[model samples]
Target chain A: WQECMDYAVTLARQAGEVVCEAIKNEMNVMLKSSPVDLVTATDQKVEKMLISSIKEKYPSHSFIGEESVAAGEKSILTDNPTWIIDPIDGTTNFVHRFPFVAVSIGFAVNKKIEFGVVYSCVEGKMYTARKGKGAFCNGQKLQVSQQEDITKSLLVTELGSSRTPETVRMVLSNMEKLFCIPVHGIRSVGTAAVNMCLVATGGADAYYEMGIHCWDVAGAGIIVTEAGGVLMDVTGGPFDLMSRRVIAANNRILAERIAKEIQVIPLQRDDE
Target chain B: WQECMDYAVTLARQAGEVVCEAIKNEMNVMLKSSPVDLVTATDQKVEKMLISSIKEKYPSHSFIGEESVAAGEKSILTDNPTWIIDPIDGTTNFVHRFPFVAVSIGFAVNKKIEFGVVYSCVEGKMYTARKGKGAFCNGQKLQVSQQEDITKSLLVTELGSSRTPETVRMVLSNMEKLFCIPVHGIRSVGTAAVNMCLVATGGADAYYEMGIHCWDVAGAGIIVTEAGGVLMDVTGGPFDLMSRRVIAANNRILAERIAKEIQVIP
Candidate 1:
């Protein structure tokens, strides 16, 4: 597990360089399910770059990647050891030059996550965690904020590019409830990796979202747990990466509180 | 006007150092209007430092600052020359150690904005604009994105700490309408200056918010207009700095189209 974590941290840093270099150039961007669903050439390039590098080292390990999954290449997370990767999470923010983007990598054995790494080039920080070990940001041990009060907690969330009327209404309705409780504030940085990283580092208290993919959270989710935070399905059950809904927070108390209040009426995404 | 812009650029850079230095120290943040509405010692320190520096050079200029205004000092935006400032635009973000904060400053003459500057220390970028000289980000001239289709445009907005049931419902209702149009995506970075600067630099197509203040948008608003983007009231009327509701976009066409469909249901 330590070896895997070391390799992942190195790989994520290298990928962060590629991501930073690409940010300096005009990207060849393309749309996915909708115009809002953006995928830049950098995204594909980086995903392939990460996958090939990992495959070269761990030839027998299974892989799950964002671009690969989007392109109909299915890599199931079964009993086999697997590597989950998001080459450039926050593609929309990257496309818009918003600068809240990162590279995420997670290593799992028999479908149980063991280690994870997330690197944000813009912030010049790398977040790493091992299952039962601890989370660290830039080599310093990370800890969740001591803030237990829900009203004072700074919450983070995102409304992904799925703009079905039902989906939109569900997000809006859920936000309304959270705001009524008046959590300090809410943010939508448009990336799951950054969201989880913030929570792990105590920059934010909670994050919940729907329609997030396995690759998006696989890496950062472990970071959350190692930072003394909780990451589980929105309903307070075991986390199913494929379930596409999650709530993460510094503690189970706040996590369950947010989970109870943020009842986003589930609606089938048209793309699915 | 160019002199003011130049000085503003210089002031912003100097202020940026102060902000970044303060971030390294422990913050003494206090609640203002609510738990979400925060004001840090750094916020007050930076505001006073900026105001005093500018006052030493331009003693006759009136000023409207976030800290001063929040303290109940009457610095209205009259027809006289005034300097509008927000020492730290994203105080909430600043308090949380989020790096998307900035220093905003605008020069106005007879109630008309002439030049403005916004500097984000974390990103190490300065965005500046003179009314007719156009906006620039980090020495490169800026322009809004050429995206004309509303559905394809990336939009930006902010959700201040106003979490009233009515405020939340209004934002949710409006978002439902905008999402129904399937406009590319919506973002809330929690900083009005950064929001408008993103639009000015072509990072996004449009920006709108209901409860923003003159200090938060005064500087970045000029950057938007100078970057070939239209800034107006949400109702397609003349923009009033005090109105607190604004629609800024790459062009009037898209602005009004958005203003029409993405109604918050006045």
Candidate 2:
């Protein structure tokens, strides 16, 4: 697991350099499923770069990458070693140069996550975590905030790509409840992976979102928990990475308190 | 004016160091007018550090600082050479270690803003602008996004310290309309100074907020216009720095388009 973690870190850094360099030039962006759901040639190029590099060394390793799934590859999590990757987690932010883009890679073995790495390319931050070991950013140990009171905590969330009136209502409605519960504040950097990382960094006390995919939170999930945080379904059940709904907080008390306020939105799971 | 600009930039950077060092310690936070309105000893200490330093050199200069106003000083603008400062712009962010805190300083002459400097302490970004010299971040030139279409722009705003039902309703209602205008996205970094600086940096297309004080936007307003953007009242009228409402956008077309969908949120 340590060797895999080190290799994952190397891949994430190399991929981050590619992402950072691409943001300097004009990008050809295209719509994926909706107008708001964006993808770029750089995303595809980087995903292929990471997979090809890993395959040459670990050819037998299975994979579930975002662009691959978008290209109709099966997203299956088996007992075999599998790498879950999101080449660029915040593509919209990348398009606008919002400076919160990241490269996420999570490795699983025997159907259990072993290690995860997420590099916020533009910010030059490398976040890594192993299952029982602690999490780190740029080699500095990471820790979640000690804030347990939801009202005093800073919460981070997102309004995802879905724009249906129902989706929009639920997203804004949840935010309103949290805002009126008057959490110290709420923020959306427009990226799920980094939002969870922020919870782990103590910059934000909690993060929860629906309509996210496994690739978005897979890497960040380990980072959060290893940094002394908790992750659970938005409904307070055990966290299922593929479920597309989750709450990552500094502690279980804060996580469940937020779960009570969330109005869960159903989305098709990645494994389904 | 150039000399004052240089001095203001120096003051901002010096004050930024104070803010950065203080963030490492356990902050002693105190509530102001509301539960959400926060202040700290650092805020007061930094405000005094700036004012006292400037008064030593420019003894005749006037001042309007956030902490001073909170301490009963009048927030009046005058024709004299005046310095408007928010010692630490994102106090809440500073308190929670959110990493977007900044020290904002704006210099005015003859009642018109002449120059501005906002140093994002944690990020170590020094944003500066003179009336016509244009804006720059860390000595690199700044420019707003050329994106003029409201539907394709990323807007930034804030839900301010006022958490009244009416205020919250208006804030979220306006957000719903913008979200459905289907603007690309919306973000709130919880700091007006940095939100406006994001527009100036082209990272965000526009930023508008009500219930903000002059010190919050005083420094950032010049930074925006100097970066080829426009600043206007939320109602599409001329921008009055003291109006406590503003829209800073890349261009007039995008700004007014957003203003239209705004539903006026009366």
Candidate 3:
């Protein structure tokens, strides 16, 4: 387990460095659908680097990333280990110099996340987790908030594209109207995987996003769960993490509450 | 003039380092009316440290900070030189660990900003400008962007308690409604001074907000104008940086356009 984790960590570090260097040069951004949904050349560069590295180091193991994916991406809990990555999770934030972005890597064996490392190059803050070892921020151990009240809780979400606007809006609108604390502050840091990783480190009490990818959550999903938290679907069912759709919180109760609120949104989703 | 500019640069560096050190520790935040507008223990601490340092060096200099201001506290821009500062201007961003905030230390002589320095400790990036010397980012000189009709350009705003709801809303809403290559995006970094300095350094196109204090714009205001950008009031007059009740932007045209568009929502 330790050896596999070390390999994944090294891969994440190298790919992240490549991205930092790529940002300094003129970035080749391809307009993906809208001007808002953008993909730069660095995304493909980092993903290809990770894929090639994983192939070289652990050819027998499988690999998946948001930019490039293999078929049959499921959470069947198999015995063989697989590596997951999101090279540049918050691409827009990077482009805009927001500096709240991260490169995520997850390692799983037997269909569960065994080790995870999410690195933020801009601030040099790293959050990591290993099965049964608890979660950590820059090496210190971490635990989610013991707070229970939904009003004062720190909730995180991915402000996705207008296509899935209803998912975030419905939950946010209801929470704002019903609560006295005004949704306890809603921040969209432009990345799903990085936000969940922040939750694992207890920087946030809960994180629930709409319209996410498996590569966005699979790594951090297992980290949050092992960090004494919960990761669930919008309806409060068990989440596969391998699926792009999810809503996670610090515990089962808040997870269920947020999930139900999101499900109550007026729009129908393709993921549904 | 050269000695004062050198001293201002040194003072700015000292102030930036002090704030950065305080921010490295976990922050203590106090709400200013709303949760969105926050002030930190570090914000006060930085101002106190800068004030003390100034007293030791330039004993007769005056100081003003956001947290401990009296109603209508008078501002001094003497024939002799006065220093204006917003130590950790983006107090909310600093408390929340956001890096788009900075320390704005601007020096003015005879009621005019001579040149100024703004530094982001998180990114270790520094911007400095003088009356004659050009604006610079990390020592590389900066040039003002010559883009026209920047209203439909990339927009950045801070959601303020005083402005932005109805007045600013009409302007932005109209721009969003009218242009093809319209306002590219919107962001709220929570610091007026840093936004002003960003305009000076070409990091952003323009910043629009109402109800800013003298401490917020005094340092950055001169930096923008000296860098060939406009800092004007809502009604298209030259901006008095010390004025607290009006709006300020990069240039006269941008300021006029924004003020004209922001209709009071009934």
- Kindly list the interface RMSD, in angstroms, of each predicted candidate in the order they appear: 1.7, 1.0, 6.0
lDDT (10s digit) by residue, model 2, range A1-272: 77777888988999999999998889898999988889999999999999998888899999999999999998879988899999999998999998899999999888778889999988889999998889999999999999887778898988887889898999888988888887778888878889999899999999999989989988999999999999999889989988989999999999999999879886889988
How far off is residue B59 in model 3, in Å?
4.8
Q: Which pairs in model 2 have colliding backbones?
A: none
lDDT of residue A268 for candidate 3:
37
In candidate 3, position A111 carries an lDDT of: 72
lDDT of 3 at A23: 60
lDDT of 2 at A212: 90
Residues B216-260, model 3: lDDT tens digits? 776666667666787766555556756553444445666666666
> Residue A23's C-alpha lDDT in candidate 2?
89
lDDT of 2: 0.90
Clashes of 2: 0
> What class would a CAPRI assessor give candidate 1's docking?
medium
Compute DockQ for each candidate against the true complex.
0.59, 0.75, 0.15
Predicted candidate 1 versus true structure: per-residue lDDT over B81-140, tens digit per residue = 899999998887788766678999988888988998999887798998887788888889
Candidate 1's clash total is 0
Model 3 agreement with the true structure over A73-186: per-residue lDDT tens digits: 443334677777788877765664445567888887777788888877766767778888888767777676665766545566643544343344454344343223333444
List the RMSD of every prediction in angstroms.
2.8, 1.1, 5.3
lDDT on C-alpha atoms for all candidate structures: 0.83, 0.90, 0.64
